[PDB]
A paper describes a structure:
A recent groundbreaking study discovered the ancient origins of the cGAS-STING pathway in bacteria, which play a similar role in the immune system to combat bacteriophage infections. Binding of cGG to bacterial STING causes it to oligomerize into long filaments and activates the nicotinamide adenine dinucleotide (NAD)+ cleavage activity of its fused N-terminal Toll/interleukin-1 receptor (TIR) domain. Depletion of the electron carrier NAD+ eventually leads to bacterial growth arrest or cell death, restricting the replication of invading phages in infected bacteria, a strategy called “abortive infection. In this study, we demonstrated two distinct mechanisms underlying the regulation of bacterial STINGs and a structural basis for cAA recognition and oligomerization.
To reveal the molecular mechanism underlying cAA recognition by ElSTING, we determined the 2.57 Å and 2.55 Å crystal structures of ligand-free and cAA-bound form of ElSTING, respectively, which forms canonical V-shaped dimer conformations. The ligand-binding pocket of CgSTING (~51 Å) is larger than that of ElSTING (~30 Å). CDN binding will induce the closure of the β-strand lids of CgSTING and ElSTING in nearly perpendicular directions. These structural differences result from the direction of rigid-body rotation upon ligand binding: with one protomer superimposed, the other ElSTING protomer rotated clockwise by ~26°, in contrast to the anti-clockwise rotation of CgSTING by ~21°. As a result, the ligand-binding pocket of ElSTING retains a nearly identical distance between the two stacking F169 residues; however, the distance between the two stacking residues in CgSTING is largely increased, facilitating the direct release of the ligand into the solvent upon inactivation.
Author numbering:
A (entry chain A), B (entry chain A): 5 to 78, 87 to 165
């Protein structure tokens, strides 16, 4: 039943169009220079939200502000400068994940406040399936395997 | 049953992260100047492939070469210079559509040649659902409604 789920296609998209694009970009730099600091290497921490919403970008904004992570653009990413020495510690919360609630909220009637028993069980399985798929793809590729970790909010 | 389909989340992604990004970029230009030619306005033709594959980018490459469309980068897009006067006629075949076969081919056994009766009926409904969702989103927004058409291969 996995491979038909939206959370599979969303983790493939995110892995190919974002994770892969950003490791290659950072490995293509003669030297990694972020706000005047040269780093040998980077970790990329992908934060899986504990709960799903149409506006994951707004959730992300609140989470990185809560956590005092500053913005580094290459497109744009978050670095914890305080806790990053020779290894730059970068973060993303995947905003693509909002398209699950957006697709559900689309093709529905306007009023609905909250989520059916069926809907909450869906987001749960979709969040965990996205995390598994994304970890699998990271680990099967020498270009991502060591440089990218998937962690909970 | 629509809103759970991957083809819904893929058309929302494509609409927000690509269609919307490119209309805004082309409307933000003091003048639209592509290979030395000033255009008043543009159409964006989104080509829906007649058949689904993991490698839609390879299908696209063959289709634009077949059709003599040259590459215009802003990120990158196709223009039919011959058939575009004051209105620039731009094209994309959405490569994101490959993630349907990629997700299916993932979580499966290595050997499989071709597609089950169940699988071919799936791609069919997913292609048509992607086209409907994408047309709906284009038409409900004054920033895309007039500038973007969805056509068959």
């Amino acid at each position: 039943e996995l491979g038909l789920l939206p959370s599979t296609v969303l983790a493939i998209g995110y892995y190919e169009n974002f994770v892969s694009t950003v490791c290659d970009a950072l490995h293509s730099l003669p030297t990694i220079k972020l706000n005047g600091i040269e780093y040998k290497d980077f970790v990329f921490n992908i934060i899986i939200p504990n709960d799903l919403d149409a506006d994951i970008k707004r959730r992300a904004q609140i989470y990185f502000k809560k956590m005092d992570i500053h913005e580094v653009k290459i497109l744009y990413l978050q670095i914890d400068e305080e806790n990053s020495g020779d290894v730059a510690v970068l973060y993303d919360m995947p905003t693509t994940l909002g398209g699950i609630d957006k697709a559900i909220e689309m093709y529905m009637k306007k009023g609905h406040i909250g989520k059916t028993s069926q809907q909450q069980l869906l987001e749960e399985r979709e969040l965990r399936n996205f995390k598994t798929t994304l970890i699998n793809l990271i680990n099967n590729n020498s270009f991502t395997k060591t440089f990218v970790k998937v962690i909970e909010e």
